[PDB]
Amino acid sequence: AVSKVYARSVYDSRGNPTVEVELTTEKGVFRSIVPSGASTGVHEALEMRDGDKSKWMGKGVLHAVKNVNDVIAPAFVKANIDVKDQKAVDDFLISLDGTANKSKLGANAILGVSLAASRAAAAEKNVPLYKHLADLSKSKTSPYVLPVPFLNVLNGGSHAGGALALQEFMIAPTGAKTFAEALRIGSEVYHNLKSLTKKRYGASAGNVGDEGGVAPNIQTAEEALDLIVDAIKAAGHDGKVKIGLDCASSEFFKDGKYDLDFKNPNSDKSKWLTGPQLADLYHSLMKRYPIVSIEDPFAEDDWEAWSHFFKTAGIQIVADDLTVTNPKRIATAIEKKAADALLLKVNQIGTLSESIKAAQDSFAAGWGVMVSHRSGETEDTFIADLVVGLRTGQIKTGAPARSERLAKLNQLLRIEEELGDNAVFAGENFHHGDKL
Amino acid sequence: AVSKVYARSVYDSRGNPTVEVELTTEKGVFRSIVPSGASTGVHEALEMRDGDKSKWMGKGVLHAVKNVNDVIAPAFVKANIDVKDQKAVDDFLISLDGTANKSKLGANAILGVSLAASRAAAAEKNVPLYKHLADLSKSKTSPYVLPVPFLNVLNGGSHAGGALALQEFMIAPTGAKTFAEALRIGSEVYHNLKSLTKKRYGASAGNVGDEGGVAPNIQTAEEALDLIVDAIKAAGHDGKVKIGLDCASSEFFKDGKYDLDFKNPNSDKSKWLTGPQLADLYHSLMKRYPIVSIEDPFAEDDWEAWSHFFKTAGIQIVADDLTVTNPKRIATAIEKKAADALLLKVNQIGTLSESIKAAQDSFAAGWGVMVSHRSGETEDTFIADLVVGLRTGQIKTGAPARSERLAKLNQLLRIEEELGDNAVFAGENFHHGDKL
Ligand SMILES: O=C(O)[C@@H](CO)OP(=O)(O)O
Ligand SMILES: [Li+]
Ligand SMILES: [Mg+2]
Ligand SMILES: [Mg+2]
């Protein structure tokens, strides 16, 4: 039934080129757009780029697109595979590549064929994308779990210009009773946060980073958190709102040491914190603010710091760069007892099937799953359907600003409204939304 | 036939609530998302907001949403209107309302039904939306015309904190041979510019405002002009990319005159200018810089100074607030010989048919039409189709950053590819793409 597969270059939300995949069947054209990260883990599957310095400063994707059109397509189409059989779909792409890392076709050629096939299959079956995804991953669907949105309000690190080391600062409305309410609450806080920011930091401070958070030239985490809690308080939602962090530590890991005083190609062989040192600081913030989740408190391969901290934290601990949505890296973390939550990113692994298995291996181990965008997003809303399909009860898809973020949030409002009484907001149970 | 009309509240690119309409026919479900400006003209059709300071700070659209659902919907459906008949659909909507400014139901309640029916009409005819918009318009279609994108790169005035009072600085890759090459050019300059800006003004200077352009504290118009032309040269595109300006003059129109330092605040009176005065700075800049378009050079009623200037400007002169997409203010302008191009903002008028007559009246008078976005945009790509539909040869939909701006531009890529040989890139002939 798949009668053609085709790629083209489109733009991500930064302006860089990205791959879009269109798959045609008797029921129509299904389109998928691949995201792109800034803060990418060493162990991510390969994103292929042209490297032609004239064009796009070397960032074009014309090779990945060619791979789609010249390599996968002809062969995908001749295998006449059932799109409803996601496994067989992916097994097929995976062996065309024939590498551990998708370094021969590029994760960015494969994913879009993966993802567009799930769309084409939902269509054959006359069901909503999230219903099919539930099928595939074998999730419970009575009721369906509406996720708590982890909205990135204050952007730091690699996501924005200025001093701030911690990359993301999030607010989580776990006290809302519905998704429409959690979004209403979250945007109210955000408009207050913005207003406070310009009052205190000047107009400029008010502009946004890549994920739609404001980016003041703040030096410490405490300053950032104080501001945010003034904003929650100001919006009148004290108590209904919690905090989550993404330290993106890996980006500032140097020897068994951690550099907070940076993005600053000279200051100081002594801001530099050791792991216990850093654990310690986390435990400070923790006693002071309503933090309920910390993601990547330690670098990608500093296994020992993770375990050490994990013993005392008593809050959700998300693995992003540590695990890169890879079942093999996930097994080690479960074993080293490093984390308790997986940051799910379909483009870190490269296929839907490998991304579902990662989620099933985490849930199996007693872990949460937070589906996340990439910092370089698109108009594509796949992940909105995926988080509901997977029953995770938690998503990270940006600030309530910039439509590559609101496109997912707007998709969640419609799904909510659709499921009516057969849905539940994760709320304070976000950590284990699968087990609701 | 239309079986249901339904509306809901979704969010815009700023995180403010807006209206989404869904129109059901035998062909499927057609939706619209209405944008929302920040700028405005006093004479604009009225957007209905709730004014509930307890929700969204008074910015809810629940009332507009209820107008659709409870007032329009029943009646629209009972009327059994031919959706291919746009005038009929809109005549209907205008009568339902009964006020000259759509203030009974609200231009946001109306626009949604209006745009959604054009999508449902296109489907029944089995043509892409642009082709049906061609139909409605009475536009030439051999070839079709792809527009020159006016890309916002840098903001001043109220968008930013130095002393600069002029509002948007845009680049226009006129020199390009296709849309695809013009967007590539456009985004290489954008990136260069963000580099320059962080080197010359600091890392925080790279954070973006509402429409994706940077906003560094600049002192003078020249300072801004020079940074732009350096960026053009750094990129290697010298000679192919022009400059467009949005003055948003009203902003510093201190009754008597034009307060440059409106941002003052110790407001240097008497040193406030009069048309003929401002007109000379304009002229001065035009001689030093490759400006090709100037928007809202004088305030929305200061008709006096528009004519005055128009006499010898010799470049495209765009009417935004002065006209507000109203066939009443266009006539005056045309009659006054104030400007030669209309910025077209559908939600300024409230219906698709009124937007088309307005563009039709401009073209009649020999003016150009720059279809345009609003600051509060959505993932909807309606204006992509509309610009190719009307054959205007120029659009303004923001920087190549943030996907409520790239959605439109990505959508013109797909279009250009779909027309193949049936299309042409406006290039240098942008002021008159209709007569191409
Ligand atoms: O670090 C991260 O979790 C992500 C998402 O906010 O950023 P990036 O896509 O750039 O890795
Ligand atoms: Li990351
Ligand atoms: Mg992360
Ligand atoms: Mg304007």
PDB file of C-alpha atoms in Angstrom, chain A residues 190-418:
ATOM      1  CA  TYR A 190       5.168  32.787  32.455  1.00  0.00           C
ATOM      2  CA  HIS A 191       3.547  36.154  31.663  1.00  0.00           C
ATOM      3  CA  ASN A 192       4.335  37.292  35.238  1.00  0.00           C
ATOM      4  CA  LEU A 193       7.840  35.848  35.047  1.00  0.00           C
ATOM      5  CA  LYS A 194       8.446  37.833  31.886  1.00  0.00           C
ATOM      6  CA  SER A 195       7.075  41.049  33.366  1.00  0.00           C
ATOM      7  CA  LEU A 196       9.221  40.676  36.511  1.00  0.00           C
ATOM      8  CA  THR A 197      12.279  40.025  34.316  1.00  0.00           C
ATOM      9  CA  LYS A 198      12.146  43.281  32.374  1.00  0.00           C
ATOM     10  CA  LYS A 199      11.230  45.157  35.537  1.00  0.00           C
ATOM     11  CA  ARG A 200      14.431  43.917  37.149  1.00  0.00           C
ATOM     12  CA  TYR A 201      16.786  43.134  34.262  1.00  0.00           C
ATOM     13  CA  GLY A 202      15.766  45.592  31.575  1.00  0.00           C
ATOM     14  CA  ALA A 203      13.832  44.973  28.344  1.00  0.00           C
ATOM     15  CA  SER A 204      16.536  42.880  26.724  1.00  0.00           C
ATOM     16  CA  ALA A 205      16.333  40.374  29.566  1.00  0.00           C
ATOM     17  CA  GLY A 206      12.818  39.812  28.242  1.00  0.00           C
ATOM     18  CA  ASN A 207      13.778  38.208  24.892  1.00  0.00           C
ATOM     19  CA  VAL A 208      13.787  34.484  24.587  1.00  0.00           C
ATOM     20  CA  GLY A 209      16.103  31.555  24.228  1.00  0.00           C
ATOM     21  CA  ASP A 210      15.657  28.695  21.716  1.00  0.00           C
ATOM     22  CA  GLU A 211      12.918  27.007  23.726  1.00  0.00           C
ATOM     23  CA  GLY A 212      10.866  30.110  24.406  1.00  0.00           C
ATOM     24  CA  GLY A 213      12.093  30.789  27.905  1.00  0.00           C
ATOM     25  CA  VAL A 214      13.244  34.272  28.910  1.00  0.00           C
ATOM     26  CA  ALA A 215      17.079  34.515  29.193  1.00  0.00           C
ATOM     27  CA  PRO A 216      18.239  37.217  31.686  1.00  0.00           C
ATOM     28  CA  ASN A 217      22.023  37.556  32.141  1.00  0.00           C
ATOM     29  CA  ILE A 218      21.834  35.855  35.595  1.00  0.00           C
ATOM     30  CA  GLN A 219      24.919  34.423  37.268  1.00  0.00           C
ATOM     31  CA  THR A 220      23.426  31.983  39.756  1.00  0.00           C
ATOM     32  CA  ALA A 221      20.718  29.297  39.979  1.00  0.00           C
ATOM     33  CA  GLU A 222      19.353  30.866  43.205  1.00  0.00           C
ATOM     34  CA  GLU A 223      18.687  34.163  41.515  1.00  0.00           C
ATOM     35  CA  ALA A 224      16.879  32.254  38.747  1.00  0.00           C
ATOM     36  CA  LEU A 225      14.750  30.207  41.230  1.00  0.00           C
ATOM     37  CA  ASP A 226      13.964  33.228  43.456  1.00  0.00           C
ATOM     38  CA  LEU A 227      12.698  35.058  40.375  1.00  0.00           C
ATOM     39  CA  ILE A 228      10.527  32.078  39.322  1.00  0.00           C
ATOM     40  CA  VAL A 229       9.035  31.629  42.738  1.00  0.00           C
ATOM     41  CA  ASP A 230       8.313  35.405  42.786  1.00  0.00           C
ATOM     42  CA  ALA A 231       6.496  34.765  39.499  1.00  0.00           C
ATOM     43  CA  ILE A 232       4.420  31.811  40.776  1.00  0.00           C
ATOM     44  CA  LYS A 233       3.484  33.891  43.840  1.00  0.00           C
ATOM     45  CA  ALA A 234       2.664  36.889  41.688  1.00  0.00           C
ATOM     46  CA  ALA A 235       0.412  34.840  39.397  1.00  0.00           C
ATOM     47  CA  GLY A 236      -1.399  33.617  42.488  1.00  0.00           C
ATOM     48  CA  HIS A 237      -0.631  29.914  41.983  1.00  0.00           C
ATOM     49  CA  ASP A 238       1.649  29.203  44.904  1.00  0.00           C
ATOM     50  CA  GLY A 239       1.364  25.504  45.775  1.00  0.00           C
ATOM     51  CA  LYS A 240      -0.233  24.457  42.507  1.00  0.00           C
ATOM     52  CA  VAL A 241       3.223  24.739  40.882  1.00  0.00           C
ATOM     53  CA  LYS A 242       6.432  22.795  41.227  1.00  0.00           C
ATOM     54  CA  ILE A 243       9.891  23.070  39.699  1.00  0.00           C
ATOM     55  CA  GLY A 244      12.035  20.851  37.497  1.00  0.00           C
ATOM     56  CA  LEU A 245      15.622  21.431  36.330  1.00  0.00           C
ATOM     57  CA  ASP A 246      17.707  20.292  33.438  1.00  0.00           C
ATOM     58  CA  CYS A 247      21.344  20.951  34.364  1.00  0.00           C
ATOM     59  CA  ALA A 248      22.718  19.691  31.020  1.00  0.00           C
ATOM     60  CA  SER A 249      25.859  19.069  33.080  1.00  0.00           C
ATOM     61  CA  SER A 250      27.614  17.178  30.307  1.00  0.00           C
ATOM     62  CA  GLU A 251      28.076  20.500  28.516  1.00  0.00           C
ATOM     63  CA  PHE A 252      30.227  21.720  31.400  1.00  0.00           C
ATOM     64  CA  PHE A 253      32.024  18.495  32.469  1.00  0.00           C
ATOM     65  CA  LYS A 254      35.865  18.819  32.476  1.00  0.00           C
ATOM     66  CA  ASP A 255      37.824  15.972  34.139  1.00  0.00           C
ATOM     67  CA  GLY A 256      36.078  14.799  37.361  1.00  0.00           C
ATOM     68  CA  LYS A 257      35.156  18.418  37.419  1.00  0.00           C
ATOM     69  CA  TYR A 258      32.265  20.693  36.788  1.00  0.00           C
ATOM     70  CA  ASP A 259      32.492  24.319  35.502  1.00  0.00           C
ATOM     71  CA  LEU A 260      29.683  26.591  36.446  1.00  0.00           C
ATOM     72  CA  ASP A 261      31.590  29.879  35.962  1.00  0.00           C
ATOM     73  CA  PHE A 262      31.554  29.501  32.224  1.00  0.00           C
ATOM     74  CA  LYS A 263      30.209  29.949  28.803  1.00  0.00           C
ATOM     75  CA  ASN A 264      33.173  32.049  29.485  1.00  0.00           C
ATOM     76  CA  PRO A 265      36.280  31.088  27.566  1.00  0.00           C
ATOM     77  CA  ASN A 266      38.531  32.466  30.339  1.00  0.00           C
ATOM     78  CA  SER A 267      37.028  32.590  33.846  1.00  0.00           C
ATOM     79  CA  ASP A 268      38.331  30.407  36.362  1.00  0.00           C
ATOM     80  CA  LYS A 269      40.105  27.152  37.219  1.00  0.00           C
ATOM     81  CA  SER A 270      38.330  27.523  40.489  1.00  0.00           C
ATOM     82  CA  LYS A 271      34.555  27.866  40.059  1.00  0.00           C
ATOM     83  CA  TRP A 272      35.175  24.227  39.152  1.00  0.00           C
ATOM     84  CA  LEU A 273      33.216  21.859  41.286  1.00  0.00           C
ATOM     85  CA  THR A 274      33.748  18.166  41.896  1.00  0.00           C
ATOM     86  CA  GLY A 275      30.727  15.776  41.836  1.00  0.00           C
ATOM     87  CA  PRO A 276      30.056  15.572  45.619  1.00  0.00           C
ATOM     88  CA  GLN A 277      30.616  19.278  45.550  1.00  0.00           C
ATOM     89  CA  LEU A 278      27.870  19.569  42.913  1.00  0.00           C
ATOM     90  CA  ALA A 279      25.618  16.993  44.667  1.00  0.00           C
ATOM     91  CA  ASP A 280      25.894  19.246  47.676  1.00  0.00           C
ATOM     92  CA  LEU A 281      24.754  22.326  45.853  1.00  0.00           C
ATOM     93  CA  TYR A 282      21.748  20.394  44.463  1.00  0.00           C
ATOM     94  CA  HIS A 283      20.807  19.391  47.986  1.00  0.00           C
ATOM     95  CA  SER A 284      20.901  23.148  48.889  1.00  0.00           C
ATOM     96  CA  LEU A 285      18.549  24.325  46.171  1.00  0.00           C
ATOM     97  CA  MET A 286      16.426  21.317  47.075  1.00  0.00           C
ATOM     98  CA  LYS A 287      15.812  22.314  50.673  1.00  0.00           C
ATOM     99  CA  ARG A 288      14.985  25.888  49.475  1.00  0.00           C
ATOM    100  CA  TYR A 289      12.674  25.409  46.454  1.00  0.00           C
ATOM    101  CA  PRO A 290       9.812  23.198  45.298  1.00  0.00           C
ATOM    102  CA  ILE A 291      11.972  21.046  43.014  1.00  0.00           C
ATOM    103  CA  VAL A 292      10.401  17.712  42.012  1.00  0.00           C
ATOM    104  CA  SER A 293      12.697  16.670  39.184  1.00  0.00           C
ATOM    105  CA  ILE A 294      16.367  17.127  38.214  1.00  0.00           C
ATOM    106  CA  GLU A 295      17.597  15.937  34.807  1.00  0.00           C
ATOM    107  CA  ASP A 296      21.260  15.169  34.068  1.00  0.00           C
ATOM    108  CA  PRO A 297      22.681  16.317  37.418  1.00  0.00           C
ATOM    109  CA  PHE A 298      25.941  14.517  36.298  1.00  0.00           C
ATOM    110  CA  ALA A 299      27.729  13.950  33.020  1.00  0.00           C
ATOM    111  CA  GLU A 300      26.900  11.261  30.461  1.00  0.00           C
ATOM    112  CA  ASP A 301      29.513   8.764  31.618  1.00  0.00           C
ATOM    113  CA  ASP A 302      30.131   9.806  35.270  1.00  0.00           C
ATOM    114  CA  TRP A 303      28.203   6.777  36.385  1.00  0.00           C
ATOM    115  CA  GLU A 304      29.555   6.922  39.927  1.00  0.00           C
ATOM    116  CA  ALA A 305      28.314  10.446  40.733  1.00  0.00           C
ATOM    117  CA  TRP A 306      24.783   9.419  39.621  1.00  0.00           C
ATOM    118  CA  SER A 307      24.510   6.375  41.897  1.00  0.00           C
ATOM    119  CA  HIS A 308      26.049   8.268  44.751  1.00  0.00           C
ATOM    120  CA  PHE A 309      23.485  11.086  44.515  1.00  0.00           C
ATOM    121  CA  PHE A 310      20.557   8.856  43.591  1.00  0.00           C
ATOM    122  CA  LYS A 311      20.814   7.202  47.048  1.00  0.00           C
ATOM    123  CA  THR A 312      19.864  10.430  48.843  1.00  0.00           C
ATOM    124  CA  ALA A 313      17.845  12.573  46.429  1.00  0.00           C
ATOM    125  CA  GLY A 314      14.203  11.373  47.056  1.00  0.00           C
ATOM    126  CA  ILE A 315      12.934  13.206  43.949  1.00  0.00           C
ATOM    127  CA  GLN A 316      12.668  12.229  40.261  1.00  0.00           C
ATOM    128  CA  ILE A 317      16.061  11.936  38.541  1.00  0.00           C
ATOM    129  CA  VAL A 318      15.967  12.143  34.775  1.00  0.00           C
ATOM    130  CA  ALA A 319      18.545  10.641  32.395  1.00  0.00           C
ATOM    131  CA  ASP A 320      18.873  12.322  29.063  1.00  0.00           C
ATOM    132  CA  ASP A 321      22.491  12.316  27.992  1.00  0.00           C
ATOM    133  CA  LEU A 322      23.306   9.411  30.315  1.00  0.00           C
ATOM    134  CA  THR A 323      20.937   7.083  28.453  1.00  0.00           C
ATOM    135  CA  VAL A 324      20.138   8.783  25.111  1.00  0.00           C
ATOM    136  CA  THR A 325      16.899   6.775  24.675  1.00  0.00           C
ATOM    137  CA  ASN A 326      18.974   3.586  24.153  1.00  0.00           C
ATOM    138  CA  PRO A 327      17.836   0.333  25.755  1.00  0.00           C
ATOM    139  CA  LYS A 328      21.471  -0.828  26.139  1.00  0.00           C
ATOM    140  CA  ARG A 329      22.534   2.334  28.035  1.00  0.00           C
ATOM    141  CA  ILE A 330      19.279   2.213  29.913  1.00  0.00           C
ATOM    142  CA  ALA A 331      20.018  -1.347  31.173  1.00  0.00           C
ATOM    143  CA  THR A 332      23.296  -0.144  32.716  1.00  0.00           C
ATOM    144  CA  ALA A 333      21.637   2.801  34.480  1.00  0.00           C
ATOM    145  CA  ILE A 334      18.917   0.539  35.880  1.00  0.00           C
ATOM    146  CA  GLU A 335      21.716  -1.712  37.026  1.00  0.00           C
ATOM    147  CA  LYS A 336      23.965   0.996  38.476  1.00  0.00           C
ATOM    148  CA  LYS A 337      20.763   2.402  40.057  1.00  0.00           C
ATOM    149  CA  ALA A 338      21.564   5.849  38.795  1.00  0.00           C
ATOM    150  CA  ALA A 339      18.180   7.374  37.868  1.00  0.00           C
ATOM    151  CA  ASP A 340      14.499   6.578  37.976  1.00  0.00           C
ATOM    152  CA  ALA A 341      13.253   8.440  34.964  1.00  0.00           C
ATOM    153  CA  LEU A 342      14.021   8.325  31.252  1.00  0.00           C
ATOM    154  CA  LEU A 343      14.015  11.398  29.006  1.00  0.00           C
ATOM    155  CA  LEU A 344      12.539   9.928  25.804  1.00  0.00           C
ATOM    156  CA  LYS A 345      13.811  11.362  22.471  1.00  0.00           C
ATOM    157  CA  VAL A 346      12.952   9.403  19.285  1.00  0.00           C
ATOM    158  CA  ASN A 347      15.791  11.135  17.428  1.00  0.00           C
ATOM    159  CA  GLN A 348      18.424  10.042  19.998  1.00  0.00           C
ATOM    160  CA  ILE A 349      17.770   6.321  18.900  1.00  0.00           C
ATOM    161  CA  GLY A 350      16.380   6.917  15.383  1.00  0.00           C
ATOM    162  CA  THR A 351      13.317   4.673  15.242  1.00  0.00           C
ATOM    163  CA  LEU A 352       9.892   4.476  16.870  1.00  0.00           C
ATOM    164  CA  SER A 353      10.358   0.780  17.733  1.00  0.00           C
ATOM    165  CA  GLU A 354      13.606   1.429  19.568  1.00  0.00           C
ATOM    166  CA  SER A 355      11.962   4.411  21.381  1.00  0.00           C
ATOM    167  CA  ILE A 356       9.003   2.268  22.553  1.00  0.00           C
ATOM    168  CA  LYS A 357      11.334  -0.487  23.805  1.00  0.00           C
ATOM    169  CA  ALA A 358      13.298   2.120  25.723  1.00  0.00           C
ATOM    170  CA  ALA A 359       9.988   3.227  27.355  1.00  0.00           C
ATOM    171  CA  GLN A 360       8.923  -0.403  28.049  1.00  0.00           C
ATOM    172  CA  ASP A 361      12.389  -1.242  29.623  1.00  0.00           C
ATOM    173  CA  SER A 362      12.092   1.865  31.877  1.00  0.00           C
ATOM    174  CA  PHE A 363       8.489   1.168  33.019  1.00  0.00           C
ATOM    175  CA  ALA A 364       9.569  -2.419  33.575  1.00  0.00           C
ATOM    176  CA  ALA A 365      12.357  -1.228  35.867  1.00  0.00           C
ATOM    177  CA  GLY A 366       9.977   0.994  37.927  1.00  0.00           C
ATOM    178  CA  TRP A 367      10.925   4.241  36.125  1.00  0.00           C
ATOM    179  CA  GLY A 368       9.035   7.227  34.775  1.00  0.00           C
ATOM    180  CA  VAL A 369       9.307   8.354  31.133  1.00  0.00           C
ATOM    181  CA  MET A 370       9.202  12.122  30.174  1.00  0.00           C
ATOM    182  CA  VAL A 371       8.746  12.516  26.405  1.00  0.00           C
ATOM    183  CA  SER A 372      10.745  15.566  25.271  1.00  0.00           C
ATOM    184  CA  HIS A 373      11.142  17.779  22.266  1.00  0.00           C
ATOM    185  CA  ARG A 374      14.598  18.746  20.909  1.00  0.00           C
ATOM    186  CA  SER A 375      15.747  22.473  21.265  1.00  0.00           C
ATOM    187  CA  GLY A 376      15.534  22.665  17.485  1.00  0.00           C
ATOM    188  CA  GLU A 377      11.877  21.737  16.950  1.00  0.00           C
ATOM    189  CA  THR A 378       9.273  21.954  14.207  1.00  0.00           C
ATOM    190  CA  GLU A 379       5.602  22.395  13.521  1.00  0.00           C
ATOM    191  CA  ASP A 380       5.352  18.614  13.760  1.00  0.00           C
ATOM    192  CA  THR A 381       3.200  17.487  16.715  1.00  0.00           C
ATOM    193  CA  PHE A 382       4.062  13.738  16.922  1.00  0.00           C
ATOM    194  CA  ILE A 383       5.224  13.824  20.512  1.00  0.00           C
ATOM    195  CA  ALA A 384       1.895  15.206  21.678  1.00  0.00           C
ATOM    196  CA  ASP A 385       0.278  11.901  20.466  1.00  0.00           C
ATOM    197  CA  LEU A 386       3.241   9.810  21.699  1.00  0.00           C
ATOM    198  CA  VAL A 387       3.151  10.971  25.313  1.00  0.00           C
ATOM    199  CA  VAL A 388      -0.625  10.120  25.475  1.00  0.00           C
ATOM    200  CA  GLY A 389      -0.073   6.799  23.622  1.00  0.00           C
ATOM    201  CA  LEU A 390       2.674   5.759  26.102  1.00  0.00           C
ATOM    202  CA  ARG A 391       0.650   6.669  29.219  1.00  0.00           C
ATOM    203  CA  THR A 392       3.691   8.447  30.800  1.00  0.00           C
ATOM    204  CA  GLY A 393       1.974  11.373  32.540  1.00  0.00           C
ATOM    205  CA  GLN A 394       4.793  13.814  31.731  1.00  0.00           C
ATOM    206  CA  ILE A 395       6.160  15.869  28.897  1.00  0.00           C
ATOM    207  CA  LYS A 396       8.820  18.470  28.188  1.00  0.00           C
ATOM    208  CA  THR A 397       7.964  20.561  25.163  1.00  0.00           C
ATOM    209  CA  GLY A 398       9.087  24.089  25.891  1.00  0.00           C
ATOM    210  CA  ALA A 399       7.751  27.377  27.199  1.00  0.00           C
ATOM    211  CA  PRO A 400       4.274  28.556  26.337  1.00  0.00           C
ATOM    212  CA  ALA A 401       5.943  30.791  23.689  1.00  0.00           C
ATOM    213  CA  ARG A 402       7.108  29.972  20.106  1.00  0.00           C
ATOM    214  CA  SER A 403       4.683  27.834  18.104  1.00  0.00           C
ATOM    215  CA  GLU A 404       7.076  24.836  17.687  1.00  0.00           C
ATOM    216  CA  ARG A 405       6.276  24.485  21.387  1.00  0.00           C
ATOM    217  CA  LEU A 406       2.582  25.555  21.411  1.00  0.00           C
ATOM    218  CA  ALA A 407       1.893  23.249  18.454  1.00  0.00           C
ATOM    219  CA  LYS A 408       2.413  20.280  20.853  1.00  0.00           C
ATOM    220  CA  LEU A 409       0.555  21.992  23.701  1.00  0.00           C
ATOM    221  CA  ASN A 410      -2.425  22.911  21.406  1.00  0.00           C
ATOM    222  CA  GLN A 411      -2.440  19.262  20.255  1.00  0.00           C
ATOM    223  CA  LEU A 412      -2.814  18.109  23.931  1.00  0.00           C
ATOM    224  CA  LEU A 413      -5.779  20.448  24.464  1.00  0.00           C
ATOM    225  CA  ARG A 414      -7.585  18.930  21.480  1.00  0.00           C
ATOM    226  CA  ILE A 415      -6.791  15.318  22.573  1.00  0.00           C
ATOM    227  CA  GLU A 416      -8.007  16.124  26.095  1.00  0.00           C
ATOM    228  CA  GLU A 417     -11.235  17.560  24.817  1.00  0.00           C
ATOM    229  CA  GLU A 418     -11.643  14.529  22.514  1.00  0.00           C
TER     230      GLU A 418
END
